[PDB]
């Protein structure tokens, strides 16, 4: 009944091939990158942080926030499987469940309702919905949540820029572009409040 060693290896290599998809569609990678995309866009820098470090910080942030779920998968699924306590079929299910639970904690009821009706299936409990339908609902909630956080992050930088523009216009110099003057002020206020540490607390802790 249990999959043979040859077939289990084939399944293992298959999931490694789809590993980039699982990061950007099932884990918290999508929300972090979108929020960090807003932060780069909000400040006057266009490509200054560069794409490489943002993804690298996002990957490390995901491993931080996915550590509880990854450890739960390790304990429940990997440990019985390594010790040959359980078969491969049930070990795979034991690993799938923590991922499903985490995606439910970061989704909305309205999003699930739309896709479960879209799939044209019958279900009564959100806890046993297929992962094929949970994934589109999860990322849709993630994109909406990220836009909410990004909108809140965009407001203080908009506040600073509007104040500087008003001050320059009030002083009479209708000739100077507000962006050049406002950029150091936005950066200074981003540093002396330790903005990134605050963003870490409101982003890593946003999942719970």
């Amino acid at each position: 009944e249990d999959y043979s060693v040859t077939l289990q290896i084939l399944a293992l290599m298959t999931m490694l091939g789809f590993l980039p998809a699982m990061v950007i569609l099932m884990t918290s990678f999508t929300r972090i990158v979108v929020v960090m995309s807003i932060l780069r866009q909000a400040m006057g820098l266009q490509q200054t942080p560069s794409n490489q470090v943002i993804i690298g910080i996002a990957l490390f942030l995901t491993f931080f926030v996915m550590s509880p779920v990854l450890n739960e998968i390790n304990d429940k699924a990997v440990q019985p499987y390594l010790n040959e306590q359980v078969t491969a079929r049930e070990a795979f299910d034991a690993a799938q469940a923590p991922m499903k639970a985490f995606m439910l904690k970061q989704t909305r009821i309205k999003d699930l309702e739309t896709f479960v009706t879209m799939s044209g299936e019958q279900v009564d409990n959100p806890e046993d919905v297929s992962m094929a339908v949970l994934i589109p609902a999860f990322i849709t909630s993630e994109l909406k949540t990220a836009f909410q956080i990004g909108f809140m992050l965009f407001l203080p930088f908009l506040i600073i820029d509007l104040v500087v523009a008003s001050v320059l216009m009030a002083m009479g110099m209708m000739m100077l572009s507000p962006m050049i003057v406002s950029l150091p002020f936005k950066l200074m206020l981003f540093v002396l409040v330790d903005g990134w540490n605050l963003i870490l607390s409101t982003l890593a802790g946003s999942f719970a």
């Binding site: 942080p49 490390f60 942030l61 550590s67 150091p184």
Partner: protein, 242 residues
């Protein structure tokens, strides 16, 4: 003896240390550059692992090469290597951040000028040698078998974005104030006649001073790099628990 034990151990005792070494190289500033071919980088990783082999302690024999536990070992060797590599990328891109903030404030590619010079700083200060010394030390204090980056290491590495802005602003605070005060002084002094304005005339004036200020920035940039490297090196040792 049964020859299986001898052959399997060497592959386990070589490839697993090599994976961590190779993973650091592909993310490293110099060895992970686009100029070098993968083949040259591959041979460099092979040669480094062979040479530093005596200093690497023997891996535990409990974990088998063909087992899921051995598969996890390969992944966690890469994570350690990428951790060191990303730190080096963080420093250089922070100088790229320093170049672009000056260029943006200069009414204006200037990041490349700082990126190239910072790469020279990395090479001249033997930064590549120190990183290689760090990864071999990682084998001692962070053994291959038992050990991996914890959650705290991920959060410390994720918090380096604030390190970028604070360090970049600290380097440019004196220059950026100079850029603002001359532009504000130019604005107020020419505000008497609204016929002149600045527009493109202000573009020319701003960029000439901005290039001149970058000349001042390069005059005292080395001291900032030395302090920055100490912060980065301390973070790396924290990852490897040294």
């Amino acid at each position: 003896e049964y020859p299986t034990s001898v052959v399997l151990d060497w592959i386990a005792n070589y490839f697993w240390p090599y994976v961590r070494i190779s993973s650091m190289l592909m993310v490293m500033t110099v060895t992970g550059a686009r100029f070098v071919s993968p083949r040259i980088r591959l041979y460099l990783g092979l040669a480094i692992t062979f040479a530093v082999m005596p200093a690497i302690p023997a891996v535990p024999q409990d974990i088998e090469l063909l087992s899921f536990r051995g598969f996890m070992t390969i992944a966690e060797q890469m994570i350690i290597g990428i951790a060191m590599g990303m730190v080096t990328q963080f420093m250089i891109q922070t100088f790229v951040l320093l170049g672009q903030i000056l260029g943006m404030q200069s009414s204006l590619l200037l990041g490349q000028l700082f990126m190239f010079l910072t790469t020279m700083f990395f090479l001249a200060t033997d930064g590549h040698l120190k990183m290689l010394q760090l990864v071999v030390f990682s084998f001692k204090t962070l053994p291959i078998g038992s050990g991996s980056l914890n959650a705290v290491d991920f959060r410390e590495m994720a918090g380096w974005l604030g390190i970028m802005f604070q360090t970049a602003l600290s380097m440019s605070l004196s220059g950026i104030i100079a850029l603002l005060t001359i532009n504000l002084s130019f604005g107020v002094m020419t505000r008497a006649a609204p016929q002149l304005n600045i527009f493109s005339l202000g573009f020319a004036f701003a960029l000439m001073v901005g290039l001149l200020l970058c000349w001042y920035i390069l005059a005292g940039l080395y001291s900032h790099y030395e302090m920055f490297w100490t912060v980065g090196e301390a973070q790396i040792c924290r990852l490897i628990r040294l």
